[PDB]
């Protein structure tokens, strides 16, 4: 049982929960690989017992009448069909629990508040598009963002798969040149290469919202134009730097992740987009200032008349911070939910405390919980963490080609 | 079959074959990763020694030669006859440089070849130990043109207790507990401060009182030594544009000299071997001055800056910390005392990773320690995946002697 210390306060806890890790991680006694982003059939019933057992534990209902009962239909379902369907209440328990278990998510204090839309009866490409469009509208909710997940049918053998080819529902295009450089977003150049390679009209500039490539089983992806009034976006201005708005910067409201595989009770949903609300450092620090993203830090510093000729002026730092100020200011003005990294990390500490009493610990990926600016100014920096894999879970999955 | 490692900023990919030589075992398993935790018989002595001699004869391009087999036999004989062995001076210098090179939490390892090694293995008392340390401080400080140095005291050996420096660094500020329960000066140093008084030191009562040295010679209680004040170079902190900042009366010292770690070379242990380089500005400006459990000045600075401290979304903490770091950089540059900013330091560490990949097939590195504690993703190390593992020679943590 690993001893975990908070160095700001001196408190000690033990992560007893780590004793239940399933799909093992990449670290060995001889080398740690925690900084890697991507770490390297009669047994469907094993991890299916597991989940049902977890479900009935929570609701004060382990070992009696109802718990005994639900254990049988699943074995009989898999004995008959080789797979099984989840009760609606289980699908919601599994959606939230998988969120609770996401080690890289700093927003887990919200894990109990989740809206689960059950698209397990989906049928075609036009079908998911309606399911996804209901999602965006509901999640966006005019800027009062509401966490949601839309769960499409569980994969079965012999036939294809529902899969959203976009990494997110809202993603900006990226346009090359004779010189390879990108107008727009370089994280979305490949998918842009496919979206054009499927009929779409590539726009002019930097913040063109990409269309959607949705994949009904076995058939080629169908493009789907997203209705403009569905895609809520925020123009970026600064509270005191009047020229910031003239830079023409924009970001979208809904962070809606559509490429991860939800796994509950041994079942696998390759299309299950979840969405919450942004933390501001995501947009301002990573999306706008990463050197392989919009990479605007130097342009903002020029406009602030900063001395970019020596690193010791901390011009990168000063410009980065005002970018984050502008992100927060703009979103709050447009009345769109956003959380600064100080507020977010302080809530995660409260979540860690809640999980200690609830489950005896919490899986947490230190490198992803500490924000990309001002890390030691947040409490999670001084908090030791244990990272392991619990089920149910969100997993990474290969790109569908 | 070795870990693949990607740099996400550029798209680079390398494989860390060096990790396969990991001579000892860290804290993680495939069950759970503990990478974020701060703190994780002649036959084995001979096999460590053999690996090291092999390493040394590799460096001098003499692997497997006559002299090399000679040394393996000599070391085998001395362990048989005495249970231990003595390094040659040239092996000691190699060994110390290599322990630096292997240190996964050091961002300054581009410098690992430029290390002054002071052989104090003939040191006989606390009083001689103190003279050695004073010469270390004077050489490394060099009037603000800092030089990396290590002074290595006698190794652990059977029959005799250890040399130990009780202080965690050669230059530390006192931390006076109080009632009302708060700490005046540096709260990281309350324990060592109390021990100095209990061993006779007359305490001060300021916030920046340099501590005496508590020096332990084998099988002897520690002995207190005052540093000559003209040997301890300090930097008073001013901000280039916020002129009220000087009125805070903050100071920091020029020399960072870690004195409580254990140097391991070829199975030998040196429990007293202080080493020093020069500061990276974030250690002072961010950690030492802004950590809530250190001097904790952030809010008082942000109030003086007229920031809006009642809501977090104004990023008042970020803005005040950036200016504290600017003051640190400015003040050391003004005083002509070596300092590197986290941008320049992480850039040179990236060159170190390239040099090492070509030299050795990898580099052990602790991401959470290499990534600076402000402006993380603005530096290139943030976007570099890294493999953490333990190589020998090494600097190791050891328990406090009390
Ligand atoms: C409600 C407010 C939420 C906030 C503020 C938030 C914040 C974050 C942040 C900042 C990250 C780091 C990702 C990055 O830096 O690119 C993250 C990762 C993640 N979050 Fe959340 N999140 C929220 C809700 C949710 C919800 C509703 C789910 C799922 C039901 C979720 C599951 C995850 C997962 C699986 C990851 C891992 C992403 C990856 O590994 O690529 N979070 N979250
Ligand atoms: C010359 C310039 C140097 C710079 C800029 C530098 C920088 C740093 C920094 C920023 C850290 C992390 C410290 C912390 O957060 O508390 C560190 C740790 C460390 N450095 Fe270096 N260093 C230098 C020289 C040296 C030398 C000469 C040695 C040994 C011969 C060394 C060995 C270490 C070790 C062992 C650690 C780990 C300390 C620990 O784990 O507690 N460094 N260094
Ligand atoms: C639920 C939620 C709320 C919120 N506010 N932010 C969230 C951010 C992410 C998130 C994490 C990592 C990512 O990158 C993976 C990657 C892919 C390819 C190459 C490199 N890296 C991406 C890029 N799609 C998004 C996920 C969920 C979030
Ligand atoms: C060689 C060099 C150059 C440079 N510029 N900076 C350096 C900083 C450190 C360093 C690392 C960790 C530390 O923490 C230990 C601790 C103990 C107990 C409780 C909490 N923390 C301390 C505190 N003395 C210092 C080491 C070497 C450095
Ligand atoms: C190499 C390194 O692991 C990589 O840059 C990680 C670091 N921490 C991160 N943390 C978050 N939240 N998101 C990220 O994309 C990353 N990237
Ligand atoms: C809990 C956490 O590991 C701890 O606060 C670490 C994080 N990274 C660090 N990085 C450096 N350079 N120095 C430190 O003291 C720490 N502390
Ligand atoms: Cl994003
Ligand atoms: Cl220090
Ligand atoms: Gd101007
Ligand atoms: Gd001024
Ligand atoms: Gd005051
Ligand atoms: Zn690990």
| Plot region of B84 (φ>0 → left; ψ -120 to 50 → alpha; else → beta) | beta
End-to-end CA distance of chain A: 42
| Plot region of B200 (φ>0 → left; ψ -120 to 50 → alpha; else → beta) | left
Q: Are strands B149-152 and B275-276 parallel, antiparallel or unpaired?
A: antiparallel
- A360 burial class (0-12, 13-18, 19+ CB within 10 angstroms)? middle
Q: Which atom of ligand 6 is nearest to the CA of B368?
A: 8
B286–chain A nearest CA distance, Å: 8
Architecture of domain A15-120+147-157+261-275+345-369: Alpha-Beta Complex (3.90)
CA angle B135, B138, B142 (to 5 degrees): 145
Q: Which atom of ligand 4 is nearest to the CA of B172?
A: 24
Alpha carbon distance B288, B327 (integer Å)? 14
Q: Is the CB of A344 under 6 A from ligand 1?
A: yes
Contact between B378 and A32 using a beta-carbon 8 Å cutoff: no
User: A290 CA distance to ligand 3 centroid (A)?
Assistant: 14
Q: Is the CB of A107 under 6 A from ligand 1?
A: yes
Q: Which atom of ligand 6 is nearest to the CA of B372?
A: 12
How far lies B134's CA from each of A112, A331, B121, B222, in Å? 60, 57, 16, 17
Alpha carbon distance A185, A208 (integer Å)? 9
CA-based radius of gyration for chain A: 22
- Beta carbons within 10 angstroms of residue B197's beta carbon: 14
End-to-end CA distance of chain B: 45
Alpha carbon distance A49, A77 (integer Å)? 13
DSSP string, A117-131: EE-TT--SHHHHHHH
Q: Are B203 and B222 in contact (CB under 8 A)?
A: no
CA angle B154, B159, B161 (to 5 degrees): 55
| Plot region of A36 (φ>0 → left; ψ -120 to 50 → alpha; else → beta) | beta
Six-digit token string for B214 = 């508590």
Q: Which residues contact A285 (CB under 8 A, 6 or more apart)?
A: A320, A323, A324, A371, A372, A373, B377, B378
Six-digit token string for B276 = 């020093």
Q: At what angle do helices A65-81 and A46-58 cross, to 10 degrees?
A: 150
Q: Which residues contact A17 (CB under 8 A, 6 or more apart)?
A: A355, A359, A360, A361, A362, A363, A390
Look at residue B335 and give its three-state secondary structure. Answer: helix
Write the DSSP symbol of residue B312: S
Look at residue B31 and give its three-state secondary structure. Answer: coil
How far lies B105's CA from each of A104, B2, B21, B102, B396, in Å? 23, 21, 18, 9, 11
Find the residue in A nearest to B317 (Cα): A377
A367–chain B nearest CA distance, Å: 7
Q: Is the CB of A397 under 6 A from ligand 3?
A: no
Contact between B28 and A27 using a beta-carbon 8 Å cutoff: yes
User: A34 CA distance to ligand 7 centroid (A)?
Assistant: 22
Contact between A384 and B6 using a beta-carbon 8 Å cutoff: no
Contact between A31 and B22 using a beta-carbon 8 Å cutoff: yes
Architecture of domain B123-147+162-233+397-401: Alpha-Beta Complex (3.90)
Count how many pairs of residues, chain A against chain B, have C-beta atoms within 8 Å: 210
Alpha carbon distance A335, B341 (integer Å)? 38
Q: Whose CA is nearest to atom 1 of ligand 6?
A: A384
- Side-chain-side CA neighbours of A373 within 13 Å: the count stands at 34
Alpha carbon distance A253, A331 (integer Å)? 8
Say whether B28 counts as a known binding-site residue: yes
Alpha carbon distance A92, A94 (integer Å)? 5
Query: What class, spelled out in words, does domain B16-122+148-158+262-276+346-370 have in CATH?
Result: alpha beta
Find the residue in B nearest to A238 (Cα): B314
Residue A268 forms beta bridges with which residues?
A263
Alpha carbon distance A295, A305 (integer Å)? 18
Contact between B36 and A385 using a beta-carbon 8 Å cutoff: yes
Alpha carbon distance A251, A170 (integer Å)? 10
Q: Whose CA is nearest to atom 40 of ligand 2?
A: B105
Q: Which residues contact A287 (CB under 8 A, 6 or more apart)?
A: A185, A251, A293, A294
Say whether A287 counts as a known binding-site residue: yes
Q: Are A384 and B37 in contact (CB under 8 A)?
A: yes
Alpha carbon distance A231, A133 (integer Å)? 10
Alpha carbon distance B286, A156 (integer Å)? 53
Of A29, A370, A376, the CB nearest to B286: A376
Sign of CA dihedral A90, A92, A93, A95: positive
Is A229 catalytic? The answer is no
Six-digit token string for A230 = 């569905």
Six-digit token string for A73 = 């239909």
Contact between B26 and A29 using a beta-carbon 8 Å cutoff: yes
Sign of CA dihedral B319, B323, B326, B328: negative
Structure determination method: X-ray
Q: Are A225 and A135 in contact (CB under 8 A)?
A: no
B110-143 as b/e: b if 16+ CB within 10 A:
bbbeebbbbebbebeebeebbebbbebbeebbee
CA angle B280, B355, A28 (to 5 degrees): 85
Q: Are strands B279-280 and B339-340 parallel, antiparallel or unpaired?
A: parallel
Alpha carbon distance A382, B299 (integer Å)? 18
Q: Whose CA is nearest to atom 15 of ligand 3?
A: A37
For A233-255+278-343, CATH number out of 3.90.1230.10, 3.90.1210.10, 3.40.50.720, 3.90.400.10 equals: 3.90.1230.10
Q: Whose CA is nearest to atom 27 of ligand 3?
A: A257
Residue in the structure block whose two tokens are 């963490």: A385
Look at residue B263 and give its three-state secondary structure. Answer: strand
Alpha carbon distance A113, A56 (integer Å)? 19
Q: Are B317 and B365 in contact (CB under 8 A)?
A: no
Q: Are A74 and A84 in contact (CB under 8 A)?
A: yes
Closest CA to A258 of A142, A136, A144: A136
- A4 burial class (0-12, 13-18, 19+ CB within 10 angstroms)? buried
Calculate the CA dihedral of residues B367, B373, B377, B379 and round it to 10 degrees.
Answer: -80
- Beta carbons within 10 angstroms of residue B49's beta carbon: 24
Q: Is the CB of A110 under 6 A from ligand 1?
A: yes
Residue in the structure block whose two tokens are 């980065």: A320
Q: Whose CA is nearest to atom 5 of ligand 4?
A: B279
Interface test with B, best of A377, A378, A381, A390 (most B CBs within 10 A): A377
Residue A81 forms beta bridges with which residues?
none
Q: Are B100 and B112 in contact (CB under 8 A)?
A: yes
A224–chain B nearest CA distance, Å: 30
| Plot region of A248 (φ>0 → left; ψ -120 to 50 → alpha; else → beta) | left
Q: At what angle do helices A315-333 and B316-335 cross, to 10 degrees?
A: 170
Resolution given for this structure, in angstroms: 2.0
Contact between B375 and A316 using a beta-carbon 8 Å cutoff: yes
Alpha carbon distance A183, A204 (integer Å)? 9
Say whether B173 counts as a known binding-site residue: no
Fold of B234-256+279-344: 3.90.1230
Size of chain B, expressed as the number of residues it contains: 402
- Beta carbons within 10 angstroms of residue A188's beta carbon: 20
Q: Are B279 and B339 in contact (CB under 8 A)?
A: yes
Of B30, B367, B385, the CB nearest to A27: B30
| Residues after which chain A has a gap (C–N > 2.5 Å) | 40
Q: Whose CA is nearest to atom 6 of ligand 2?
A: B108
Residue A387 forms beta bridges with which residues?
B33
Q: Which residues contact B111 (CB under 8 A, 6 or more apart)?
A: B148, B277
Residue B7 forms beta bridges with which residues?
B12, B384
Six-digit token string for A62 = 């382990």
Q: Which atom of ligand 6 is nearest to the CA of B369?
A: 10
Closest CA to A93 of A43, A47, A56, A139: A56
Q: At what angle do helices B42-59 and B89-101 cross, to 10 degrees?
A: 90
How far lies A371's CA from each of A249, B251, B372, in Å? 22, 29, 12
Alpha carbon distance A135, A275 (integer Å)? 9
Alpha carbon distance B130, B115 (integer Å)? 21
Per-domain residue ranges of chain B: 16-122+148-158+262-276+346-370, 123-147+162-233+397-401, 234-256+279-344
Alpha carbon distance A279, A108 (integer Å)? 12
Alpha carbon distance B90, B103 (integer Å)? 20
User: B300 CA distance to ligand 11 centroid (A)?
Assistant: 7
Six-digit token string for B5 = 């490692």
Say whether A75 counts as a known binding-site residue: no
Look at residue B186 and give its three-state secondary structure. Answer: coil
Q: At what angle do helices B42-59 and B66-82 cross, to 10 degrees?
A: 160
| Residues after which chain B has a gap (C–N > 2.5 Å) | 40
Look at residue A213 and give its three-state secondary structure. Answer: strand
Q: Are B50 and B23 in contact (CB under 8 A)?
A: no
Beta-sheet strands, E only, within B164-287? 164-165, 175-176, 184-185, 213-216, 223-225, 234-236, 251-253, 257-258, 262-265, 268-270, 275-276, 279-280
Residue A118 forms beta bridges with which residues?
A151
Look at residue B345 and give its three-state secondary structure. Answer: helix
Say whether B163 counts as a known binding-site residue: no
Contact between B367 and A35 using a beta-carbon 8 Å cutoff: yes
Q: Are A169 and A254 in contact (CB under 8 A)?
A: yes
Fold of A121-146+161-232+396-400: Nitric Oxide Synthase;Heme Domain; Chain A, domain 2 (3.90.440)
How far lies B369's CA from each of B136, B339, B381, in Å? 26, 18, 10
Is A289 catalytic? The answer is no
Interface test with A, best of B36, B188, B342 (most A CBs within 10 A): B36
Alpha carbon distance A252, A174 (integer Å)? 16
Look at residue A239 and give its three-state secondary structure. Answer: coil
Q: Which residues contact A358 (CB under 8 A, 6 or more apart)?
A: none
Could you give phi then psi for residue A231, rounded to 5 degrees? Answer: -100, 100
| H or E stretch covering B191 | helix B190-198
Q: Are B228 and B134 in contact (CB under 8 A)?
A: yes
A233–chain B nearest CA distance, Å: 20
Active-site residue numbers of B?
A: 106, 109, 278, 283
Residue in the structure block whose two tokens are 């569905």: A230
> Which residues of B fall within a CB distance of 8 Å from A382?
291-293
A137–chain B nearest CA distance, Å: 27
């Amino acid at each position: 049982f690993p001893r975990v210390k908070n160095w700001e306060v001196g408190s000690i806890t033990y992560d007893t929960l780590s004793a239940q890790a399933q799909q093992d991680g990449p670290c060995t006694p001889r080398r740690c690989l925690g900084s890697l982003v991507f770490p390297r059939p009669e047994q469907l019933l094993s991890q299916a017992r597991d989940f049902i057992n977890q479900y009935y534990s929570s609701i004060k209902r382990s070992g009696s009448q109802a718990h005994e009962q639900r254990l049988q239909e699943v074995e009989a379902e898999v004995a008959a069909t080789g797979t099984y369907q989840l009760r609606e209440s289980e699908l919601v328990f599994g959606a939230k629990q998988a969120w609770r278990n996401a080690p890289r998510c700093v927003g887990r204090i919200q894990w109990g508040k989740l809206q689960v839309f059950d698209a397990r009866d989906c049928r075609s490409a036009q079908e998911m598009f309606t399911y996804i469009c209901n999602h965006i509208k509901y999640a966006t909710n005019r800027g009062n963002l509401r966490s949601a997940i839309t769960v499409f049918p569980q994969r079965c053998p012999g036939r294809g798969d529902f899969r959203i080819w976009n990494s997110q529902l809202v993603r900006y295009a990226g346009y090359r040149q004779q010189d390879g450089s990108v107008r727009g977003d370089p994280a979305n150049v490949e998918i842009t290469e496919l979206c054009i390679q499927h009929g779409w009209t590539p726009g002019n500039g930097r913040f063109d919202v990409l269309p959607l490539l949705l994949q009904a089983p076995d058939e080629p992806p169908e493009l789907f134009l997203l209705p403009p009034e569905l895609v809520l976006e925020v123009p970026l201005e600064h509270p005191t730097l009047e020229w910031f708005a003239a830079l023409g910067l924009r970001w979208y409201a809904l962070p809606a992740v559509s490429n991860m595989l939800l796994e509950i009770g041994g079942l696998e949903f390759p299309a299950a987009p979840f969405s919450g609300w942004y933390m501001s450092t995501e947009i301002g620090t990573r999306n706008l200032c990463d050197p392989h993203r919009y990479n605007i830090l130097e342009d903002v510093a020029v406009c602030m008349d900063l001395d970019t000729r020596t690193t010791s002026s901390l011009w990168k730092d000063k410009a980065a911070v005002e970018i984050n100020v502008a992100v927060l200011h703009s979103y709050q003005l447009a009345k769109v939910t956003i959380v600064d990294h100080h507020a977010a990390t302080a809530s995660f500490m409260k979540h860690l405390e809640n999980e200690q009493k609830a489950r005896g610990g919490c899986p947490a990926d230190w490198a992803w919980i500490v924000p990309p600016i001002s890390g030691s100014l947040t409490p999670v920096f001084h908090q030791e963490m244990v990272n392991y894999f619990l089920s149910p879970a969100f997993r990474y999955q290969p790109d569908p080609w």
